[PDB]
């Protein structure tokens, strides 16, 4: 794998780790169909000595069109310690999302994931698959959508997107898992347009918390909700406010 000139948004860097804020349209690791143009290529360009760290220090990933935080190891001791912390469920990886459907409670989805039996670029829940756990809470209700905050225990392929689709609440804009139903009845022109143009899963890695792999000091980072999701949330919020105004008066 070769260095490529792909700018990264570095949130924090010290001797041992890098925190990045990943944009959409950026694959983390080379794969079938994506031989290059990845975060790994970008890291090798930014800090060539990282080639001496397993997988260029990449210890966890996000979907191509999921935005937000990743932690990357710069050194061998940092990489080993981060992997161990992940194995021990000692790193918080928190996500903001907008899901389709009104939802009434938070919860946990503890369901294993496999490749879909006929569609090879899709994953699926399956009893015999790779164990996976996602926790979710409701941040804000909308009319026929819900703003969620999610935390991972595991990081299986398409895990959040698959788990939310499994419970009948796929993420808005998800091009694979059913994120583009007809807009809500009575939606404003602005709401219809924003939904039409929102063409990725509404998923963002919003917060990381961990014990620093070398110093042991507890640290936390944030990535602001990207503008696309800000616009989406604000229009859904305005729509729900209009709805409340129609029904909350006796």
């Amino acid at each position: 794998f070769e260095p490529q000139d792909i700018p990264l948004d570095i949130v924090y860097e010290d001797e041992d780790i890098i925190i990045i804020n990943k944009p959409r349209d950026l694959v983390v690791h080379p794969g079938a169909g994506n031989p290059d143009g990845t975060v790994l290529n970008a890291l090798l360009h930014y800090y060539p000595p990282i080639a001496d760290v397993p997988r260029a220090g990449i210890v966890h990933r996000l979907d191509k069109d999921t935005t937000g935080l990743m932690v990357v190891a710069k050194t061998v001791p940092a990489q080993t310690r981060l992997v161990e912390s992940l194995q021990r469920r000692e790193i918080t990886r928190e996500y903001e999302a907008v899901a389709i459907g009104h939802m009434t409670a938070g919860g946990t989805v503890d369901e294993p994931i496999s490749r879909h039996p006929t569609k090879r670029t899709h994953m699926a829940v399956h009893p015999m698959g790779k164990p996976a756990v996602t926790h979710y809470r409701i941040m804000e209700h909308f009319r026929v959508h819900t703003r969620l905050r999610l935390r991972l225990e595991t990081g299986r392929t398409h895990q959040i997107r698959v788990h939310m689709a499994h419970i009948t609440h796929p993420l808005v804009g998800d091009p694979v898992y059913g994120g583009r139903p007809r807009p809500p009845k009575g939606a404003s022109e602005a709401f219809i347009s924003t939904l039409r143009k929102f063409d990725r899963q509404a998923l963002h890695a919003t917060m990381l918390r961990l014990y620093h792999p070398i110093s042991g000091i507890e640290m936390e980072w944030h990535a602001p909700i990207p503008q696309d999701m800000v616009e989406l949330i604000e229009v859904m919020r305005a729509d729900f406010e209009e709805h409340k105004d129609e029904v909350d008066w006796l």
Side-chain angles (χ1 to χ4, degrees), residues 137-183:
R137 41 215 239 263
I138 299 177
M139 294 297 102
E140 182 174 11
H141 287 105
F142 306 125
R143 192 156 50 100
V144 292
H145 301 271
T146 303
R147 183 171 152 241
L148 302 176
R149 194 155 295 162
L150 305 96
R151 285 181 185 190
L152 259 17
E153 298 193 352
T154 53
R156 301 305 187 182
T157 299
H158 299 173
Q159 181 172 316
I160 288 172
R161 295 159 65 196
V162 167
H163 272 354
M164 294 299 104
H166 172 71
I167 66 165
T168 75
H169 298 291
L171 302 186
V172 173
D174 194 320
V176 169
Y177 301 103
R180 200 184 251 73
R182 244 144 96 92

CSV table of all heavy atoms in Angstrom, one decimal, residues 137-183:
chain,number,residue,atom,x,y,z
A,137,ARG,N,-29.8,5.2,22.5
A,137,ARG,CA,-30.8,6.0,23.2
A,137,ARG,C,-31.4,7.1,22.4
A,137,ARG,O,-30.9,7.5,21.3
A,137,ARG,CB,-30.1,6.7,24.5
A,137,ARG,CG,-28.8,7.2,24.2
A,137,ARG,CD,-27.9,7.1,25.5
A,137,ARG,NE,-27.4,8.4,25.8
A,137,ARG,CZ,-26.3,8.9,25.5
A,137,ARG,NH1,-25.4,8.3,24.8
A,137,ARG,NH2,-26.1,10.2,25.9
A,138,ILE,N,-32.6,7.5,22.8
A,138,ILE,CA,-33.3,8.5,22.0
A,138,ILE,C,-33.0,9.9,22.5
A,138,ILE,O,-33.3,10.2,23.7
A,138,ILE,CB,-34.9,8.3,22.1
A,138,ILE,CG1,-35.2,6.9,21.5
A,138,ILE,CG2,-35.6,9.4,21.4
A,138,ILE,CD1,-36.7,6.6,21.6
A,139,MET,N,-32.4,10.7,21.7
A,139,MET,CA,-32.0,12.1,22.0
A,139,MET,C,-33.2,13.0,21.8
A,139,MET,O,-33.3,14.0,22.6
A,139,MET,CB,-30.8,12.5,21.1
A,139,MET,CG,-29.5,11.8,21.3
A,139,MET,SD,-28.9,12.0,23.0
A,139,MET,CE,-29.4,10.4,23.7
A,140,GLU,N,-33.9,12.8,20.8
A,140,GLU,CA,-35.0,13.7,20.3
A,140,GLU,C,-36.0,13.1,19.4
A,140,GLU,O,-35.6,12.3,18.6
A,140,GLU,CB,-34.3,14.9,19.6
A,140,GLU,CG,-35.3,16.0,19.1
A,140,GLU,CD,-34.5,17.2,18.6
A,140,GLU,OE1,-33.3,17.1,18.3
A,140,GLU,OE2,-35.2,18.2,18.4
A,141,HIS,N,-37.3,13.3,19.7
A,141,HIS,CA,-38.3,12.7,18.8
A,141,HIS,C,-38.6,13.7,17.7
A,141,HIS,O,-38.6,14.9,17.9
A,141,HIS,CB,-39.6,12.5,19.6
A,141,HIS,CG,-39.5,11.4,20.6
A,141,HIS,ND1,-39.4,11.5,22.0
A,141,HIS,CD2,-39.6,10.0,20.4
A,141,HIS,CE1,-39.3,10.3,22.5
A,141,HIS,NE2,-39.4,9.4,21.6
A,142,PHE,N,-38.8,13.1,16.5
A,142,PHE,CA,-39.4,13.9,15.4
A,142,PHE,C,-40.8,13.2,15.0
A,142,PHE,O,-41.2,12.2,15.7
A,142,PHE,CB,-38.5,14.0,14.2
A,142,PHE,CG,-37.1,14.6,14.5
A,142,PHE,CD1,-35.9,13.8,14.2
A,142,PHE,CD2,-37.0,15.8,15.2
A,142,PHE,CE1,-34.7,14.4,14.5
A,142,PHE,CE2,-35.7,16.3,15.5
A,142,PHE,CZ,-34.6,15.6,15.2
A,143,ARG,N,-41.4,13.7,14.0
A,143,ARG,CA,-42.8,13.2,13.7
A,143,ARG,C,-42.8,11.7,13.3
A,143,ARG,O,-43.5,10.9,13.9
A,143,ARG,CB,-43.4,14.1,12.6
A,143,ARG,CG,-44.9,13.8,12.5
A,143,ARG,CD,-45.7,15.0,11.9
A,143,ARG,NE,-45.1,15.5,10.6
A,143,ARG,CZ,-45.5,15.3,9.4
A,143,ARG,NH1,-46.5,14.4,9.2
A,143,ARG,NH2,-45.0,15.9,8.3
A,144,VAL,N,-41.9,11.4,12.3
A,144,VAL,CA,-41.8,10.0,11.8
A,144,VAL,C,-40.3,9.7,11.6
A,144,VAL,O,-40.0,8.9,10.7
A,144,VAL,CB,-42.6,9.8,10.5
A,144,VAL,CG1,-44.2,9.9,10.7
A,144,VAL,CG2,-42.2,10.8,9.4
A,145,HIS,N,-39.5,10.3,12.4
A,145,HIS,CA,-38.0,10.0,12.5
A,145,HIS,C,-37.6,10.2,13.9
A,145,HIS,O,-38.3,10.8,14.7
A,145,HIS,CB,-37.2,11.0,11.6
A,145,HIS,CG,-37.6,11.1,10.2
A,145,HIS,ND1,-37.0,10.2,9.3
A,145,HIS,CD2,-38.5,11.8,9.5
A,145,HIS,CE1,-37.6,10.5,8.1
A,145,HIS,NE2,-38.5,11.4,8.2
A,146,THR,N,-36.4,9.7,14.3
A,146,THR,CA,-35.9,9.8,15.6
A,146,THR,C,-34.4,10.1,15.6
A,146,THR,O,-33.7,9.5,14.9
A,146,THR,CB,-36.2,8.5,16.3
A,146,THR,OG1,-37.6,8.1,16.3
A,146,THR,CG2,-35.9,8.6,17.8
A,147,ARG,N,-34.0,11.0,16.4
A,147,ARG,CA,-32.6,11.3,16.6
A,147,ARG,C,-32.0,10.4,17.7
A,147,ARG,O,-32.5,10.4,18.9
A,147,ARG,CB,-32.4,12.8,17.0
A,147,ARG,CG,-30.9,13.2,17.1
A,147,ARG,CD,-30.8,14.7,17.2
A,147,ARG,NE,-29.6,15.1,18.0
A,147,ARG,CZ,-29.6,15.7,19.1
A,147,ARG,NH1,-30.7,16.1,19.7
A,147,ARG,NH2,-28.4,16.0,19.7
A,148,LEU,N,-31.0,9.6,17.4
A,148,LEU,CA,-30.4,8.6,18.3
A,148,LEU,C,-29.0,8.9,18.7
A,148,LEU,O,-28.3,9.5,17.8
A,148,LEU,CB,-30.5,7.2,17.7
A,148,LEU,CG,-31.8,6.7,17.2
A,148,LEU,CD1,-31.6,5.3,16.5
A,148,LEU,CD2,-32.8,6.5,18.4
A,149,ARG,N,-28.6,8.5,19.8
A,149,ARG,CA,-27.1,8.5,20.2
A,149,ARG,C,-26.8,7.0,20.4
A,149,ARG,O,-27.5,6.3,21.2
A,149,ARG,CB,-26.8,9.3,21.4
A,149,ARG,CG,-25.4,9.7,21.6
A,149,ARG,CD,-25.2,11.0,22.4
A,149,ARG,NE,-25.6,12.2,21.7
A,149,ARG,CZ,-25.9,13.3,22.2
A,149,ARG,NH1,-25.7,13.5,23.5
A,149,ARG,NH2,-26.3,14.4,21.5
A,150,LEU,N,-25.8,6.5,19.8
A,150,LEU,CA,-25.5,5.0,19.9
A,150,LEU,C,-24.1,4.8,20.4
A,150,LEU,O,-23.2,5.6,20.2
A,150,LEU,CB,-25.7,4.3,18.6
A,150,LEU,CG,-27.0,4.5,17.8
A,150,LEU,CD1,-26.9,5.6,16.8
A,150,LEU,CD2,-27.4,3.2,17.2
A,151,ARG,N,-23.9,3.7,21.1
A,151,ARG,CA,-22.5,3.3,21.6
A,151,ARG,C,-22.3,1.9,21.2
A,151,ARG,O,-23.1,1.0,21.3
A,151,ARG,CB,-22.4,3.5,23.1
A,151,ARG,CG,-22.2,4.9,23.5
A,151,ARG,CD,-22.0,5.1,24.9
A,151,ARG,NE,-22.0,6.6,25.3
A,151,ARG,CZ,-21.6,7.1,26.4
A,151,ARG,NH1,-21.3,6.2,27.4
A,151,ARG,NH2,-21.7,8.3,26.6
A,152,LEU,N,-21.0,1.6,20.7
A,152,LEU,CA,-20.6,0.3,20.3
A,152,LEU,C,-19.9,-0.5,21.4
A,152,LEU,O,-19.1,0.1,22.1
A,152,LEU,CB,-19.6,0.5,19.2
A,152,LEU,CG,-19.9,0.3,17.7
A,152,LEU,CD1,-21.3,0.4,17.2
A,152,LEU,CD2,-18.9,1.2,16.9
A,153,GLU,N,-20.2,-1.8,21.4
A,153,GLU,CA,-19.2,-2.7,22.1
A,153,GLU,C,-18.4,-3.4,21.1
A,153,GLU,O,-17.3,-3.9,21.4
A,153,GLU,CB,-20.0,-3.8,22.9
A,153,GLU,CG,-20.8,-3.2,24.0
A,153,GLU,CD,-21.3,-4.3,24.9
A,153,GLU,OE1,-21.1,-5.5,24.7
A,153,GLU,OE2,-21.9,-3.8,26.0
A,154,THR,N,-18.9,-3.5,19.8
A,154,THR,CA,-18.1,-4.2,18.8
A,154,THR,C,-18.2,-3.3,17.6
A,154,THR,O,-18.9,-2.3,17.5
A,154,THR,CB,-18.8,-5.5,18.4
A,154,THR,OG1,-20.2,-5.4,18.1
A,154,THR,CG2,-18.7,-6.5,19.6
A,155,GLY,N,-17.4,-3.7,16.5
A,155,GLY,CA,-17.4,-2.9,15.3
A,155,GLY,C,-17.5,-3.6,14.0
A,155,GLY,O,-16.6,-3.4,13.1
A,156,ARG,N,-18.5,-4.5,13.9
A,156,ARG,CA,-18.7,-5.4,12.8
A,156,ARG,C,-19.0,-4.6,11.5
A,156,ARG,O,-19.4,-3.4,11.6
A,156,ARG,CB,-19.8,-6.4,13.0
A,156,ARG,CG,-19.5,-7.3,14.2
A,156,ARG,CD,-18.1,-8.0,14.1
A,156,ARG,NE,-18.0,-9.0,15.2
A,156,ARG,CZ,-17.0,-9.8,15.4
A,156,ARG,NH1,-15.9,-9.7,14.6
A,156,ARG,NH2,-16.9,-10.6,16.5
A,157,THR,N,-18.9,-5.2,10.4
A,157,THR,CA,-19.2,-4.5,9.1
A,157,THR,C,-20.6,-3.9,9.1
A,157,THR,O,-21.6,-4.7,9.3
A,157,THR,CB,-19.0,-5.4,7.9
A,157,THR,OG1,-17.6,-5.8,7.9
A,157,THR,CG2,-19.1,-4.6,6.6
A,158,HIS,N,-20.7,-2.6,8.8
A,158,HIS,CA,-22.0,-1.9,8.7
A,158,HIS,C,-22.9,-2.1,10.0
A,158,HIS,O,-24.1,-2.0,9.9
A,158,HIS,CB,-22.9,-2.4,7.5
A,158,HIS,CG,-22.2,-2.2,6.2
A,158,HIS,ND1,-22.8,-2.8,5.0
A,158,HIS,CD2,-21.1,-1.6,5.8
A,158,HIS,CE1,-22.0,-2.4,4.0
A,158,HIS,NE2,-21.0,-1.7,4.4
A,159,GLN,N,-22.2,-2.2,11.1
A,159,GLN,CA,-22.9,-2.7,12.3
A,159,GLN,C,-24.1,-1.8,12.7
A,159,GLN,O,-25.2,-2.3,12.8
A,159,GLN,CB,-22.0,-2.8,13.5
A,159,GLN,CG,-22.7,-3.3,14.8
A,159,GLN,CD,-21.8,-3.6,15.9
A,159,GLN,OE1,-20.8,-4.2,15.7
A,159,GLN,NE2,-22.2,-3.2,17.1
A,160,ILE,N,-23.9,-0.5,12.9
A,160,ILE,CA,-25.0,0.3,13.3
A,160,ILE,C,-26.1,0.3,12.2
A,160,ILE,O,-27.3,0.2,12.6
A,160,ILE,CB,-24.6,1.7,13.6
A,160,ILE,CG1,-23.8,1.7,14.9
A,160,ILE,CG2,-25.8,2.7,13.7
A,160,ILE,CD1,-23.1,3.1,15.3
A,161,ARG,N,-25.7,0.5,11.0
A,161,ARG,CA,-26.7,0.5,9.9
A,161,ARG,C,-27.6,-0.8,9.8
A,161,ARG,O,-28.8,-0.7,9.6
A,161,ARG,CB,-26.0,0.7,8.6
A,161,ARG,CG,-25.3,2.0,8.5
A,161,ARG,CD,-24.2,2.1,7.4
A,161,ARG,NE,-24.8,1.9,6.1
A,161,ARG,CZ,-24.1,1.6,5.0
A,161,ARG,NH1,-22.7,1.4,5.1
A,161,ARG,NH2,-24.7,1.5,3.8
A,162,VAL,N,-26.9,-1.9,10.0
A,162,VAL,CA,-27.6,-3.2,9.9
A,162,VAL,C,-28.5,-3.4,11.2
A,162,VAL,O,-29.6,-3.9,11.0
A,162,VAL,CB,-26.5,-4.4,9.8
A,162,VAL,CG1,-27.1,-5.7,10.1
A,162,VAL,CG2,-25.9,-4.4,8.4
A,163,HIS,N,-28.0,-3.1,12.3
A,163,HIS,CA,-28.7,-3.3,13.6
A,163,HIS,C,-30.0,-2.4,13.6
A,163,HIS,O,-31.1,-2.8,14.0
A,163,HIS,CB,-27.8,-2.9,14.8
A,163,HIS,CG,-27.0,-4.1,15.4
A,163,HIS,ND1,-27.1,-5.4,14.9
A,163,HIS,CD2,-26.1,-4.1,16.3
A,163,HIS,CE1,-26.3,-6.1,15.6
A,163,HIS,NE2,-25.6,-5.4,16.5
A,164,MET,N,-29.8,-1.1,13.1
A,164,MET,CA,-31.0,-0.2,13.1
A,164,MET,C,-32.0,-0.7,12.0
A,164,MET,O,-33.2,-0.6,12.3
A,164,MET,CB,-30.5,1.2,12.9
A,164,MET,CG,-29.7,1.8,14.0
A,164,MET,SD,-30.7,1.8,15.6
A,164,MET,CE,-30.1,0.5,16.4
A,165,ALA,N,-31.6,-1.2,10.9
A,165,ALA,CA,-32.5,-1.8,9.9
A,165,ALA,C,-33.2,-3.0,10.5
A,165,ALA,O,-34.4,-3.2,10.3
A,165,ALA,CB,-31.7,-2.1,8.6
A,166,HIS,N,-32.5,-3.8,11.3
A,166,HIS,CA,-33.0,-5.0,11.8
A,166,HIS,C,-34.2,-4.7,12.7
A,166,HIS,O,-35.2,-5.5,12.7
A,166,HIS,CB,-32.0,-5.8,12.6
A,166,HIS,CG,-32.5,-7.0,13.4
A,166,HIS,ND1,-33.0,-8.1,12.7
A,166,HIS,CD2,-32.7,-7.2,14.7
A,166,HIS,CE1,-33.4,-9.0,13.6
A,166,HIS,NE2,-33.2,-8.5,14.8
A,167,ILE,N,-34.2,-3.6,13.5
A,167,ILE,CA,-35.3,-3.2,14.4
A,167,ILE,C,-36.4,-2.4,13.7
A,167,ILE,O,-37.2,-1.8,14.4
A,167,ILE,CB,-34.8,-2.7,15.7
A,167,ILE,CG1,-34.0,-1.3,15.6
A,167,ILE,CG2,-33.8,-3.7,16.4
A,167,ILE,CD1,-33.8,-0.6,16.9
A,168,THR,N,-36.3,-2.3,12.4
A,168,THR,CA,-37.3,-1.5,11.5
A,168,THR,C,-37.1,0.0,11.5
A,168,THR,O,-38.0,0.7,11.2
A,168,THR,CB,-38.8,-2.0,11.7
A,168,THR,OG1,-39.3,-1.4,13.0
A,168,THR,CG2,-38.9,-3.4,11.9
A,169,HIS,N,-35.9,0.4,11.9
A,169,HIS,CA,-35.6,1.8,12.0
A,169,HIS,C,-34.2,2.1,11.3
A,169,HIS,O,-33.3,2.7,11.9
A,169,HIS,CB,-35.5,2.3,13.4
A,169,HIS,CG,-36.9,2.2,14.1
A,169,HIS,ND1,-38.0,2.9,13.8
A,169,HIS,CD2,-37.3,1.3,15.0
A,169,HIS,CE1,-39.0,2.6,14.5
A,169,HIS,NE2,-38.6,1.5,15.3
A,170,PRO,N,-34.2,1.8,10.0
A,170,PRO,CA,-33.0,2.1,9.2
A,170,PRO,C,-32.7,3.6,9.2
A,170,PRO,O,-33.6,4.4,9.3
A,170,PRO,CB,-33.3,1.6,7.8
A,170,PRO,CG,-34.8,1.8,7.7
A,170,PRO,CD,-35.3,1.3,9.1
A,171,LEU,N,-31.4,3.9,9.0
A,171,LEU,CA,-31.0,5.3,9.0
A,171,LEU,C,-31.4,6.0,7.8
A,171,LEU,O,-31.3,5.5,6.7
A,171,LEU,CB,-29.5,5.4,9.3
A,171,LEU,CG,-29.0,4.7,10.5
A,171,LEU,CD1,-27.5,5.0,10.7
A,171,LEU,CD2,-29.7,5.2,11.7
A,172,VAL,N,-31.9,7.3,8.0
A,172,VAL,CA,-32.2,8.2,6.9
A,172,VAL,C,-31.0,8.3,5.9
A,172,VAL,O,-29.9,8.5,6.3
A,172,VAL,CB,-32.5,9.6,7.4
A,172,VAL,CG1,-32.7,10.6,6.3
A,172,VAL,CG2,-33.8,9.5,8.3
A,173,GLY,N,-31.4,8.1,4.6
A,173,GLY,CA,-30.4,8.3,3.5
A,173,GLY,C,-29.5,7.1,3.3
A,173,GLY,O,-28.7,7.2,2.3
A,174,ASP,N,-29.6,6.1,4.1
A,174,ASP,CA,-28.8,4.9,3.8
A,174,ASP,C,-29.2,4.3,2.5
A,174,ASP,O,-30.3,3.9,2.3
A,174,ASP,CB,-29.1,3.8,5.0
A,174,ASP,CG,-28.0,2.8,5.0
A,174,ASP,OD1,-27.6,2.3,3.9
A,174,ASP,OD2,-27.6,2.3,6.1
A,175,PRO,N,-28.2,4.2,1.5
A,175,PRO,CA,-28.5,3.7,0.2
A,175,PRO,C,-28.6,2.2,0.1
A,175,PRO,O,-29.1,1.7,-1.0
A,175,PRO,CB,-27.3,4.3,-0.6
A,175,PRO,CG,-26.2,4.4,0.3
A,175,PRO,CD,-26.8,4.7,1.7
A,176,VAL,N,-28.2,1.5,1.1
A,176,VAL,CA,-28.3,0.0,1.1
A,176,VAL,C,-29.4,-0.5,1.9
A,176,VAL,O,-30.2,-1.3,1.5
A,176,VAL,CB,-26.9,-0.6,1.6
A,176,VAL,CG1,-27.1,-2.1,1.8
A,176,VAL,CG2,-25.8,-0.3,0.6
A,177,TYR,N,-29.6,0.0,3.2
A,177,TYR,CA,-30.5,-0.6,4.2
A,177,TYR,C,-31.9,0.0,4.3
A,177,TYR,O,-32.5,-0.2,5.3
A,177,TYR,CB,-29.8,-0.7,5.5
A,177,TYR,CG,-28.5,-1.6,5.4
A,177,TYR,CD1,-27.3,-1.0,5.4
A,177,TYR,CD2,-28.6,-3.0,5.3
A,177,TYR,CE1,-26.1,-1.8,5.2
A,177,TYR,CE2,-27.5,-3.8,5.2
A,177,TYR,CZ,-26.2,-3.2,5.2
A,177,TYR,OH,-25.1,-4.0,5.0
A,178,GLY,N,-32.3,0.8,3.3
A,178,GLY,CA,-33.7,1.2,3.3
A,178,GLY,C,-34.0,2.6,3.8
A,178,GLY,O,-35.1,2.9,4.3
A,179,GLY,N,-32.9,3.4,3.7
A,179,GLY,CA,-33.0,4.8,4.2
A,179,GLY,C,-33.7,5.8,3.3
A,179,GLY,O,-33.7,7.0,3.7
A,180,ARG,N,-34.4,5.4,2.2
A,180,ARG,CA,-35.1,6.4,1.4
A,180,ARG,C,-36.6,6.1,1.1
A,180,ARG,O,-36.9,5.8,-0.1
A,180,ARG,CB,-34.4,6.8,0.2
A,180,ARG,CG,-34.8,8.2,-0.5
A,180,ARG,CD,-34.1,8.5,-1.8
A,180,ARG,NE,-33.2,9.7,-1.6
A,180,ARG,CZ,-32.0,9.6,-1.0
A,180,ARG,NH1,-31.6,8.5,-0.4
A,180,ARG,NH2,-31.3,10.7,-0.9
A,181,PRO,N,-37.5,6.0,2.1
A,181,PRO,CA,-38.9,5.9,1.9
A,181,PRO,C,-39.5,7.3,1.4
A,181,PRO,O,-38.8,8.3,1.5
A,181,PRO,CB,-39.5,5.6,3.3
A,181,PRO,CG,-38.5,6.2,4.2
A,181,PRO,CD,-37.1,6.1,3.5
A,182,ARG,N,-40.7,7.3,1.0
A,182,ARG,CA,-41.4,8.6,0.7
A,182,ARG,C,-41.3,9.5,1.9
A,182,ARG,O,-41.4,9.0,3.0
A,182,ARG,CB,-42.9,8.3,0.3
A,182,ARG,CG,-43.2,8.6,-1.1
A,182,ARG,CD,-44.2,7.7,-1.8
A,182,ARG,NE,-45.6,8.2,-1.7
A,182,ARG,CZ,-46.1,9.0,-2.7
A,182,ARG,NH1,-45.5,9.3,-3.8
A,182,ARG,NH2,-47.4,9.4,-2.5
A,183,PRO,N,-41.2,10.8,1.7
A,183,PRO,CA,-41.2,11.8,2.7
A,183,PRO,C,-42.6,11.8,3.5
A,183,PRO,O,-43.6,11.3,2.9
A,183,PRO,CB,-41.0,13.1,2.1
A,183,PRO,CG,-41.3,12.9,0.6
A,183,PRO,CD,-41.0,11.5,0.3
